[PDB]
Symmetry: C3
Subunit: 159 residues, 3 copies
């Protein structure tokens, strides 16, 4: 038994029109998220946290621009594939915690469904998955409504 | 024995006049912190880290706007209550680490008293509580003196 | 056996001309990093994460402005000294994960050499050291090319 820590961080800019996808959940909003991907900043930060704990340790690094298959690419696919590769190295899940940093939209109603998705994608109990949100009280690029940031931490177990 | 990780992040804007309260400590400063609460960004980030490790996992989520009891609400009360609920789920403390992000005021002289407070409120040794500060070298909303940010991580143990 | 968590965060502003030093690696770039030090924001964030896990828990706190010895001070020296002191308290390394937040320059080619340096300086295997990079998609002070930020987490073991 041995435990390993990981940390992830991601940002996307608002652009065009909604909805956005956060933690796998389609959330109504006036603006959309600019990206190659989903624009799922929650699942990107989480993915990086998991890869970092297993020392693998980018999504850039274990997917270099394939591009495409990949416009509106499903970030849940990225998450599950990253997870397969982490498990092949012998790791199992301790727990994850995710912090969405956004002035808006309101994340709280969608968090239980985010957790369902993440727990499915990682093959764990929901009690191993926490998600929260915070505003930056109108400060910074998140505060001015210019984009959304997310942080994530992960704990991994190896037999 | 099982260990669990949590992460917290908070921001408050400066507004009106001092002092501010950070980690429970009254710190002299030209501006105050705008909020419902203390405006304790250190103890809010910590509280979220502890709740996230126990998967509980917002302060919004286990206190929805009561509001009030709550103008100038004591963030130490929030911390202790969050802690009671975490312990009722069977968790004990591993350790916590807190990073205050502020251009000013200087946090270093007040850190030992912050640690006394936090350790009391969590019923642990002081060696289980670390607090630090950093500036952003005049960059961003913290750098321009517009507000204060804080990050926190926590490790939890379950029997 | 007991595990301990730490978190670090650092920022430096661009100023004058390159190169910069990140994770010990000299990276060509049009601007340099303003500081007393290296300006190594990666190794500063890491150092703080390690000190925070051992509750020690600033680089300000266990080096107050000596200043100098210290213009263009080698951040790897700071890292190794912080590490000596952490080991003297009885801690050994679990693992570390580092997240460089920069719009530019590109970090990916230099990451393997960063890991060599960090692993040498901490006397561990390279599999215990992860480093990644992310942009903020043109948002915030990192996005406008005004500076570089870095986050780090660390897991410590005590016999
Ligand atoms: C599996 N499938 C189908 C996929 C689903 C969803 C997304 C996929 C993607 S992706 O393009 O959406 N990957 C997430 C997008 O990366 P990001 O939001 O983190 O952007 P960023 O530019 O920050 O990162 C790109 C890479 O550049 C590198 N980088 C970043 C900054 C910097 N200063 N230096 C760097 O080297 C680093 O390795 C980083 O991973 C790629 C491949 C398969 C995907
Ligand atoms: C126990 N007592 C008495 C208390 C003491 C101190 C503070 C208390 C408080 S509080 O109001 O000070 N809670 C901390 C303030 O929250 P915050 O500084 O994190 O503000 P923010 O707006 O970021 O968070 C509010 C909630 O909105 C949610 N949110 C945030 C952003 C977003 N995009 N979506 C969301 O759903 C999320 O759940 C978050 O917890 C409430 C109840 C009892 C308190
Ligand atoms: C060992 N050798 C030789 C060394 C090598 C490389 C760097 C060294 C350095 S250093 O100057 O480069 N230390 C890193 C620079 O600190 P920083 O980039 O974190 O700057 P910042 O201003 O954020 O931090 C300074 C200190 O002020 C304190 N602080 C910060 C903000 C705030 N609001 N209050 C505070 O008290 C806190 O303790 C913090 O450590 C000092 C001594 C020996 C060094
Ligand atoms: C604590 C962390 C993770 C900080 C880095 C996040 C970031 C890119 C902030 C940028 O500036 P800002 O948005 O804070 O201020 P501004 O955009 O107004 O200059
Ligand atoms: Zn992304
Ligand atoms: Zn708050
Ligand atoms: Zn620094």
């Amino acid at each position: 038994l041995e435990m390993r820590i990981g940390h992830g961080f991601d940002v996307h800019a608002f652009g065009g029109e909604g909805p956005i996808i956060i933690g796998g959940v389609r959330i109504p909003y006036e603006k959309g998220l600019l990206a190659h991907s989903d624009g799922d900043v929650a699942l990107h930060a989480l993915t990086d946290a998991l890869l970092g704990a297993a020392a693998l340790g980018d999504i850039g690094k274990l997917f270099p621009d394939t591009d495409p298959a990949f416009k509106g690419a499903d970030s849940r696919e990225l998450l599950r594939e990253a997870w397969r590769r982490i498990q092949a190295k012998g790791y199992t899940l301790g727990n994850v915690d995710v912090t969405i940093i956004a002035q808006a939209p309101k994340m709280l109603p969608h968090i239980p469904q985010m957790r369902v998705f993440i727990a499915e994608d990682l093959g764990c109990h929901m009690d191993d998955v926490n998600v929260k949100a915070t505003t930056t009280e109108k400060l910074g690029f998140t505060g001015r409504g210019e984009g959304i940031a997310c942080e994530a931490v992960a704990l991994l177990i190896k037999a």
